[PDB]
Amino acid sequence: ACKITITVVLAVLILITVAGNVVVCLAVGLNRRLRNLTNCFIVSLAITDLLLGLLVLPFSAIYQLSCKWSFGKVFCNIYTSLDVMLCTASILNLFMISLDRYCAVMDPLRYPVLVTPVRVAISLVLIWVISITLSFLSIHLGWCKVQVNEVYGLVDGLVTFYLPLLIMCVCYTLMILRLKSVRLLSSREKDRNLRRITRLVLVVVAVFVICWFPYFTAFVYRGLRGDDAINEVLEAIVLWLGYANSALNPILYAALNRDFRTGYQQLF
């Protein structure tokens, strides 16, 4: 009885993640209006949540329901490395979009000159190269479950999640303070566009942080107080709560921004 319900829930989650990410990709690519330099990061995030669903999620589902691993160590290392790489390739795209918004808001009239398209291409290429190199030089070279230890496990929690979070919080606090202080930003329509896009980015970032904070807190604690310190139910509830964010993001994109809603309505 319970197994049927959980399998249906997992199938629904995978379905929503795949369908939503393909919808975002199709809408952004097809419609000319929605092709802008800020949406390059959003499409990258869409690909980075498309792959997690297409590949990582089905195996995690099988493993969770069956409760046994059978594919073998050779595949298992690929699956954990891939899983690790996609997380590193999502916490860097969020950083770049937040840098875009800080650059636009804090220094208006210089946004076109500073954020050149070549720079955006360099940023995406660098982000993927660093993600893949780190994932396979911390998977192939050492240091199915992620294996916490003395320095590898503790260091990753502090450097990957907690460090970008505080820079992003400082950037957003300053951006909100300037936004409140100033009266007119850049034409009235331009001001409203900047404010609405800033709201979109701030809500996507806050949703990501709220979804992934419990898992990383557990990850730090398991290093601090032992691998088996926490229960299994607490260990596996957080993972799925973290994974739900990929499905959740397309709904946020459509609801917050009118252009996404229009493009989706045209598409289907």
Epitope: L179, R188, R195, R196, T198
Partner: nanobody
Framework: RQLVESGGGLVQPGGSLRLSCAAS?????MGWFRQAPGKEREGVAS???????KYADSVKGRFTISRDNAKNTVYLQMNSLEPEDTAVYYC???????????????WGKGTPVTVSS
């Protein structure tokens, strides 16, 4: 939100009337205009949140504008009132409903002033 205007009355020539406008996210500007029976709307004074002020040529040297930030109340003090100043003095306020919202404008109902007695 409602802009309440007051201080409108019949005044003998040479009299003084202090007007007051009360507005109930942020208020950026407040202005005063006068409309006479056969004349177009004319600006008399405007004040920013900072407190910078500009005046029309005729108004200059007789009208003063100041802003109370705490209570969101502005006033205009008219001195040396003359029959040319007979008009319905209208209040005007610029405000933002929310942090992400667009800037909007507000118009008062008008306080009628007659410089006769």
């Amino acid at each position: 939100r409602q802009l309440v205007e007051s201080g409108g009355g019949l005044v003998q020539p040479g009299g003084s009337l202090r007007l007051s406008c009360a507005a109930s996210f942020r208020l950026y500007d407040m202005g005063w205009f006068r409309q006479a029976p056969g004349k177009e709307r004319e600006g008399v004074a405007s004040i920013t949140s900072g407190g910078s002020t500009k005046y029309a040529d005729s108004v200059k040297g007789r009208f003063t504008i100041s802003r109370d930030n705490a209570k969101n109340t502005v006033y205009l003090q008219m001195n040396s009132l003359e029959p040319e100043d007979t008009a319905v003095y209208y209040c005007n306020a610029e405000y933002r409903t929310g942090i992400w919202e667009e800037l909007l404008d507000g118009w008062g109902k008008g306080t009628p002033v007659t410089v006769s007695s």
